[PDB]
Amino acid sequence: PSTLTINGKAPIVAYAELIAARIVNALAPNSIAIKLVDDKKAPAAKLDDATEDVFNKITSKFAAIFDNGDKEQVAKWVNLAQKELVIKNFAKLSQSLETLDSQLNLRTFILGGLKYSAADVACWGALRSNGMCGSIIKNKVDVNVSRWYTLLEMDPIFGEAHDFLSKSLLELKKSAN
């Protein structure tokens, strides 16, 4: 059993990593212990020992669960999420989002399956981390992105990830009190 520690004071909260863990635990109970910290010196996310490339480390560890999408293809989108979709700059984000929006023209999920892949998790998590994307998604400027984003939001694994984070931060406070 691995341990994923999430930091509540990260400028970019590790939603993609959290959701990845929630997917794994839903399909394979007790696989990943999810812990919260609330400290500005802590890394955004930590899987056991590793603070770098946590998302890919989770998806690669649970290969049967994360089985879909050509790995090179998945990586293209995981990299766009991690390096572009988290950026709190409308001018950069607008370009990045058009790349995603265009990919979704004729697809329900990023890589075109009947079900979502790690690509979808990474991008959805990256956008959830980005306060700037809220008005963008709400106003449907990129119609495909909004359509896609609001689909996955309906799945509690995604849409209640924040609730889990908030409740865990509550419990962290409670244990301190």
């Binding site: 004729l106 329900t108 009947l114 449907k140 896609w148 689909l151 309906m154």
Partner: protein, 121 residues
């Protein structure tokens, strides 16, 4: 009674306990009234609009009977207009939302490659 409905009912996601809001119930209701009128073709631009902002017709996480019923009528309709299009082309860019939804439903319900609408991408 149709083969498409039967195959949808054989899927696991068929059995999920979706509860419609009034708005959702209104939406399922209006699409069944369109089906009953026989006027899905005039309502294709409305359908494309619904699908612009919603993955499935009744704003659900999974496809519903509404999707299957509308799909069964819409599929031959759409591949006719693609086949009769003057601008390949513009038809695709315009009605892309119906097209992505067609591509999902035909693959979900395992429509035969012969009856399938080939999506360009």
């Amino acid at each position: 009674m149709s083969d498409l409905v039967t195959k949808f009912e054989s899927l696991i996601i068929s059995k999920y306990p979706v509860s419609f809001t009034k708005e959702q119930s209104a939406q399922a209701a209006q699409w069944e009234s369109v089906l009953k009128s026989g006027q899905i073709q005039p309502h294709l631009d409305q359908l494309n609009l619904v699908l612009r902002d919603n993955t499935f017709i009744v704003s659900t996480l999974y496809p519903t009977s509404t999707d299957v019923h509308v799909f069964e009528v819409a599929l031959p309709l759409i591949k006719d207009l693609v086949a009769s299009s003057k601008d390949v082309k513009s038809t695709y860019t315009t009605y892309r939302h119906i097209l992505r939804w067609i591509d999902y439903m035909q693959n979900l319900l395992e429509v035969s490659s012969t009856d399938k609408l080939e999506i360009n991408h």
